[PDB]
Amino acid sequence: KDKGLDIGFIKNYLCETCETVSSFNIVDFLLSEGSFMSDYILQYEHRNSLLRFKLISDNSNNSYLIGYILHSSYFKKIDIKYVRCILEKLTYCVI
């Protein structure tokens, strides 16, 4: 919290209340009312990434990039449609 960009804006794009323009709302992420999930998302240093990439090969010389997103339990019924074709676009741009 130094130069505004965290102030509200990203707190807004994570409110489980408060709007639906962001397809992802963290369960208890509250506007200035951070109790647990706020600190966990913003302060807990050891958090794995949900977006993950893998590379496979077979006995043939075929190789594939899997990109997947594990579903978490702090998403308040995430919009599975917006992030889905974000992932195809990411998987394209990196290959």
Add this chain to the structure above:
RNA sequence: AUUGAAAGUUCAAAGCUUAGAUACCCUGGAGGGAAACCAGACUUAACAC
């Protein structure tokens, strides 16, 4: 008014002497310091555009 009357079973006297709770006898037998556990998580900032 009697086969009666009278008469202390009394005196002296150490349950003492000798004598080893000793002899033989393994705290031993059986029993796994093991069981579980990711050396891992993540990039961010600055200005230029």
